[PDB]
Subunit: 173 residues, 3 copies
């Protein structure tokens, strides 16, 4: 198992999330669909790597936990390294595990599961991929000690500003 951590951050500049409201209730419900796309940074918050991209399908409102259950299908883009694909539960109200369905580039053959940690709605999430099946060891620029997750985390000013020292080459946008 090779562990890989990343932060997903919504910077309010990619028109995301887009809510397609089809359930008649004022709350989320079955029928509602949410395409989305956020920014992706290294687990140490030092570099911009790319984006997340996909779709959340609303399954049910959970009024007792003041939250929503989604079923999610989406990918994680790492510039020229390639991508990882996932499929599973996305709960606004608690942490979950999603299936790693595959990948490409350095992530060709990837399998296992990924932990998703909800930090701040709708702006900050943290992930740890428990990666099996890769052909090589992950590149060192992706495997720095992660910053421990909290509501207060922020990307390095260099990474937010897209300075040469704060991005990977051909990071996805």
């Amino acid at each position: 198992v090779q562990e890989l951590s990343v932060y997903e951050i919504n910077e309010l500049d990619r028109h995301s999330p887009k809510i397609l409201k089809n359930a008649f209730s004022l709350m989320f419900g079955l029928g509602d669909l949410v395409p989305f796309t956020n920014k992706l940074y290294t687990g140490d918050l030092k570099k911009r790597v790319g984006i997340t991209a996909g779709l959340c399908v609303v399954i049910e409102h959970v009024p007792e936990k003041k939250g929503e259950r989604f079923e999610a299908t989406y990918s994680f883009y790492f510039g020229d390294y390639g991508h990882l694909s996932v499929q599973g539960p996305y709960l606004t109200y608690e942490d979950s595990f999603l299936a790693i369905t595959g990948g490409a580039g350095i992530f060709e053959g990837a399998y296992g599961q990924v932990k998703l940690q909800q930090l701040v709605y709708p702006t900050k999430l943290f992930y740890t991929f428990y990666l099996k099946g890769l052909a090589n060891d992950l590149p060192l620029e992706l495997t720095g000690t992660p910053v421990p997750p909290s509501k207060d985390i922020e990307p390095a000013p260099e990474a937010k500003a897209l300075e040469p020292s704060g991005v990977i080459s051909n990071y996805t946008n």
Copy 2:
């Protein structure tokens, strides 16, 4: 190769399905989308395990078969044990096989295919997963000899009424 069978049943108490009707045609056609969530029971019908949850994309009406072709992306939830994800053909008029795209929990690393039997369209479905890649033998409460699939199958009265003896631990709802 480890066999796992489950019964999916639509008890019409989960606001499911929700039909999003967009096609040019009066009948089902490309453009139509069907988000869904049904209840899930063990192969021996003794216990409630959880739910199914996902999306069917209508591909074409099949007038010579008196039904429809769907392309389906969905997950199967097993309370505390984790989940299994699938993709592939959902045909209203005949049995099909879907790809197992991955899993999480005891289903971390899952691969193979699953047989979908259209027992009573659209209310009762019976599945048989041909599961490879699991870390360990499946828990016994999930592997009781399945009840042979027939039109009049019913869950155990305790499974239906959610009594301790008829539910798995923290079964998905």
Copy 3:
């Protein structure tokens, strides 16, 4: 590793694509959904094999490339042989690699990545699957030397006319 190549062609007879417009923009943007289904032929263009079926989710318009980034979830159908499932990026203006999420039939246990080549927008596409995990060698009727992809390629007359000699058995339609 077993290579498999196929041509996907929109022959304008399958009601496809169907654009579902929700972005408040004159161009494609997040919220736009595109269900689709095209015809599939062998890499040597000698036989009709089946169809593609699935969904493209618009991520963003890409002004400087005069095109779009989609996130795509779809299957490849090969008649009685089975199906492959994929997830990943679909860029209208350049080639990409997608993840092979799984398979059924002869493709039970498939994994790896697939190269998508944008030949003529959006009507002809050429794919090469880099297939791992198959239980057996691929059938010879599927592994003829591919015709090198070009704007001017065409299926064999026998294939287009649906003669027994130009189709696989029970080719998907």
